[PDB]
Amino acid sequence: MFENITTAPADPILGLADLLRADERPGKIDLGMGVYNDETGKTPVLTSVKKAEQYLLENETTKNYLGIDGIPEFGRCTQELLFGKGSALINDKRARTAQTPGGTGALRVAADFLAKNTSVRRVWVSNPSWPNHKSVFNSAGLEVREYAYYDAENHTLDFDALINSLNEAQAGDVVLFHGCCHNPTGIDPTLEQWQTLAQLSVEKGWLPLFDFAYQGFARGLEEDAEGLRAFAAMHKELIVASSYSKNFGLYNERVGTCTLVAADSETVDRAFSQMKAAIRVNYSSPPAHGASVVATILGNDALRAIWEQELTDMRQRIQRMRQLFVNTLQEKGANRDFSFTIKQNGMFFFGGLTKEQVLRLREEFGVYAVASGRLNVAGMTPDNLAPLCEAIVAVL
Amino acid sequence: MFENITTAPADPILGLADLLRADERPGKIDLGMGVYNDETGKTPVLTSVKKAEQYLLENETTKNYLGIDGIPEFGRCTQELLFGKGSALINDKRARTAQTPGGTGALRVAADFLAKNTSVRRVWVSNPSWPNHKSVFNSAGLEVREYAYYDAENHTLDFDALINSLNEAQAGDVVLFHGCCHNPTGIDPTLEQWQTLAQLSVEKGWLPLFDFAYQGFARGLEEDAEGLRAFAAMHKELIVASSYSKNFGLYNERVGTCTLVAADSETVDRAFSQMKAAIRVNYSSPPAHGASVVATILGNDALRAIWEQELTDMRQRIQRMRQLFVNTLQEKGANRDFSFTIKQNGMFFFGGLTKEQVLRLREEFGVYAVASGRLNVAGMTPDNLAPLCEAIVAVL
Ligand SMILES: *Cc1c(COP(=O)(O)O)cnc(C)c1O
Ligand SMILES: *Cc1c(COP(=O)(O)O)cnc(C)c1O
Numbered sequence: 001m002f003e004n005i006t007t008a009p010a011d012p013i014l015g016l017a018d019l020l021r022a023d024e025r026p027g028k029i030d031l032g033m034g035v036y037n038d039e040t041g042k043t044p045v046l047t048s049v050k051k052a053e054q055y056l057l058e059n060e061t062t063k064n065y066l067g068i069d070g071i072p073e074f075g076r077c078t079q080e081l082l083f084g085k086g087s088a089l090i091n092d093k094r095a096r097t098a099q100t101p102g103g104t105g106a107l108r109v110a111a112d113f114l115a116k117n118t119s120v121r122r123v124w125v126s127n128p129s130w131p132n133h134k135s136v137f138n139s140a141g142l143e144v145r146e147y148a149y150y151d152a153e154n155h156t157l158d159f160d161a162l163i164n165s166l167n168e169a170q171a172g173d174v175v176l177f178h179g180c181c182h183n184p185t186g187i188d189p190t191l192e193q194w195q196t197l198a199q200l201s202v203e204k205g206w207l208p209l210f211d212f213a214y215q216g217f218a219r220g221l222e223e224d225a226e227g228l229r230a231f232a233a234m235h236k237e238l239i240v241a242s243s244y245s246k247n248f249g250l251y252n253e254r255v256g257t258c259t260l261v262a263a264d265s266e267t268v269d270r271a272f273s274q275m276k277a278a279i280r281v282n283y284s285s286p287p288a289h290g291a292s293v294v295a296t297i298l299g300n301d302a303l304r305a306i307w308e309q310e311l312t313d314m315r316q317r318i319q320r321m322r323q324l325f326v327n328t329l330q331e332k333g334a335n336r337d338f339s340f341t342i343k344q345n346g347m348f349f350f351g352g353l354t355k356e357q358v359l360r361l362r363e364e365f366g367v368y369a370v371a372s373g374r375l376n377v378a379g380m381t382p383d384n385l386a387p388l389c390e391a392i393v394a395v396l
Numbered sequence: 397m398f399e400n401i402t403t404a405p406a407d408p409i410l411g412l413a414d415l416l417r418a419d420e421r422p423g424k425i426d427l428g429m430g431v432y433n434d435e436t437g438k439t440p441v442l443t444s445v446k447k448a449e450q451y452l453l454e455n456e457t458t459k460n461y462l463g464i465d466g467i468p469e470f471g472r473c474t475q476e477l478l479f480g481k482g483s484a485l486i487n488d489k490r491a492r493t494a495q496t497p498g499g500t501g502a503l504r505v506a507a508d509f510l511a512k513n514t515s516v517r518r519v520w521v522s523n524p525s526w527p528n529h530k531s532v533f534n535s536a537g538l539e540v541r542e543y544a545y546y547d548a549e550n551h552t553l554d555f556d557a558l559i560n561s562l563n564e565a566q567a568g569d570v571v572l573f574h575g576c577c578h579n580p581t582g583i584d585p586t587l588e589q590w591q592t593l594a595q596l597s598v599e600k601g602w603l604p605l606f607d608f609a610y611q612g613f614a615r616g617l618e619e620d621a622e623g624l625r626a627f628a629a630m631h632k633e634l635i636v637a638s639s640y641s642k643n644f645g646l647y648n649e650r651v652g653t654c655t656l657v658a659a660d661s662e663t664v665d666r667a668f669s670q671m672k673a674a675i676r677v678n679y680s681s682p683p684a685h686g687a688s689v690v691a692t693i694l695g696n697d698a699l700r701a702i703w704e705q706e707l708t709d710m711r712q713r714i715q716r717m718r719q720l721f722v723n724t725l726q727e728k729g730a731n732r733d734f735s736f737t738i739k740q741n742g743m744f745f746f747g748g749l750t751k752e753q754v755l756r757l758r759e760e761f762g763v764y765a766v767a768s769g770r771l772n773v774a775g776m777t778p779d780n781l782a783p784l785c786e787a788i789v790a791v792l
């Protein structure tokens with residue numbers, strides 16, 4: 001069977017981990033995968049998470065199966081983060097959430113759901129976007145098209161090109177939108193633009209699909225949900241996949257959700273039964289630990305208070321880091337002006353380097369970034385900032 | 397989109413959980429899902445697991461991503477449980493294991509792997525078998541055929557019918573075998589029969605796929621692996637999916653593995669890269685907690701000692717329970733002779749009731765079992781044994 005099998009090409013993001021382990025040069029700077037690092041260059045487990053785990057340890061009595069859609073309390077809590085306390089969606093019982101294995105698992109289930117229960121044939125992904133998007137939808141059997149988004153020249157959102165290219169999207173097509181902190185550009189639509197996209201969407205007949213992986217990293221929990229919420233108030237149906245890997249620092253515990261929204265409760269229930277069937281045929285039920293931790297935190301006011309301050313701290317460290325990055329670059333006499341970095345939201349720096357420049361960075365300096373020229377700013381520490389900038393200047 | 401969607405039919409096993417929550421009659425007896433229960437009718441978290449969790453709590457420093465195939469130490473440990481300490485497979489580096497979300501996740505990944513990287517078009521499943529098998533393979537796009545196995549009349553393995561029906565399996569076909577504790581019959585092949593199937597398999601050109609969900613529940617860890625091992629010594633390629641939900645009582649933490657075996661290390665590596673690609677497009681990486689617990693236990697001699705005694709205890713409680721079950725049935729003046737129950741391995745009782753009899757059991761008595769007439773013996777306690785047997789006698 002396996003005699004003619006070809007070696008699959010390494011993942012453009014995850015492949016960096018393998019490369020790094022083989023490179024024994026001490027001063028390696030990892031700016032690849034989008035995980036948070038503290039001032040010491042370590043990705044630690046939040047204090048709020050440790051405390052919740054303590055609670056679980058002491059009060060957990062069984063590890064019996066969770067139910068296809070997972071921990072009920074967890075779904076309720078995620079809905080409020082996304083839609084808001086007194087959301088009409090929540091109150092009209094138009095939403096159903098399923099706990100999934102990370103944000104990727106959520107995208108996979110929505111894709112399987114779509115592929116087999118609707119007439120959806122294609123999904124529109126921004127150009128550029130997280131690489132795994134195309135892969136997830138294509139493996140489900142869906143065709144993936146791309147719409148204009150970034151403006152490499154001005155480093156902004158080319159709204160006109162976005163709209164003009166999306167006019168090719170027919171009714172019944174899925175249009176994938178990043179809730180906030182657009183991976184990898186860091187450029188998000190203004191609230192005004194979100195409303196325009198919302199009205200255009202309903203008018204054209206698109207099925208919105210939001211990918212929320214960084215809620216809380218742009219401006220704050222609620223502020224970051226404005227885009228989705230503008231879409232929620234006008235749409236009958238929509239799908240939203242979120243992750244808790246980044247904002248809770250629970251990467252390996254695989255915590256995320258897939259939410260379905262329909263015109264009413266009976267439609268959403270009928271649809272949700274098919275989503276559960278797609279899950280039963282994948283992993284059966286989701287992993288409890290990570291979601292249990294998230295439910296425990298959000299549900300307890302004290303733990304929630306500590307968690308929110310931790311999220312605020314992380315965001316604040318990244319914002320200060322990108323400013324310090326641009327400042328140090330000028331001191332090293334960097335060729336180009338990278339001030340646009342400060343306008344980007346999230347953990348990434350994008351639009352400054354070329355593929356060959358990043359290749360030379362790892363080759364000659366041991367600095368690891370994604371081939372598209374995307375650097376994890378959250379991986380920059382006061383200690384490595386200097387030798388890193390020196391590496392960049394020598395490559396410009 | 398979701399206007400014409402049909403309601404998916406409830407799962408034949410998992411659907412019991414929903415039914416039970418709506419039935420408010422106090423004396424409900426749950427004998428559906430195959431989860432272990434102690435003398436009090438509770439499914440607790442093992443002491444060995446609690447201790448490992450304590451260790452994790454104290455010594456875990458990060459929750460950063462695990463790597464597509466998961467915790468390396470965990471894969472190594474699972475290979476020894478399955479193949480044995482000095483296995484040639486391990487030493488010739490012909491095996492590669494991927495940590496997956498439970499045993500179902502493992503079956504799903506192997507299915508996606510098969511469907512897209514090999515010429516496999518069909519899988520042979522025993523009649524009967526766990527219901528989710530067909531579903532998992534069909535959703536992957538593979539055709540599912542069935543081979544004779546059980547003998548309802550004599551309550552044994554109809555070996556002749558098995559072989560005779562499997563002769564319809566062409567070379568390049570996948571043949572799914574349950575490692576031990578056949579779900580739901582509880583009838584497994586004798587070691588002699590395993591060797592016959594092994595020789596027949598190689599001669600016919602079948603691709604073996606073992607489902608290991610109850611290793612340690614029939615006779616013991618090693619004894620239960622004899623069947624697979626007889627197949628391993630003669631086969632170049634094979635796939636094995638295992639679960640740790642039952643033998644470690646880590647149901648909701650979703651712990652399992654998918655192992656690939658090829659003629660040599662280079663072939664297995666080439667093949668394994670495609671399996672990783674299939675995972676990246678599903679859930680990206682697996683949940684660390686459950687597997688971390690399993691790695692911690694198996695790796696530490698003291699914890700392993702406690703765990704093995706816990707497994708021995710569980711098995712011993714089920715063996716005593718089925719004997720007490722048959723004994724109490726005769727005292728209640730049961731119509732039929734159910735002594736064959738004692739010959740079955742695992743947590744289940746199968747072959748005594750009809751669909752209508754199980755319907756009447758939940759309807760009139762609140763006793764819940766699977767519609768196929770399969771009862772979870774591990775759910776029987778000294779307290780419920782009597783009213784349960786009374787319910788059965790009144791239905792015979
Ligand atoms: C991180 C990320 C994901 C994946 O979420 P997981 O929890 O790691 O599976 C999905 N989409 C985007 C845009 C991401 O940044
Ligand atoms: C329990 C079981 C599974 C599922 O394993 P999970 O860890 O629950 O996903 C698979 N196959 C058989 C035969 C089982 O009994």
Ligand SMILES: O=C(O)CCCC(=O)O
Binds near residue numbers: 032033034035130183
């Ligand atoms: O790729 C992933 O699965 C996680 C890191 C996210 C990113 O770097 O875009």
Ligand SMILES: O=C(O)CCCC(=O)O
Binds near residue numbers: 284410428430431579
């Ligand atoms: O069905 C499942 O997913 C778990 C219980 C196993 C069984 O009852 O066969």
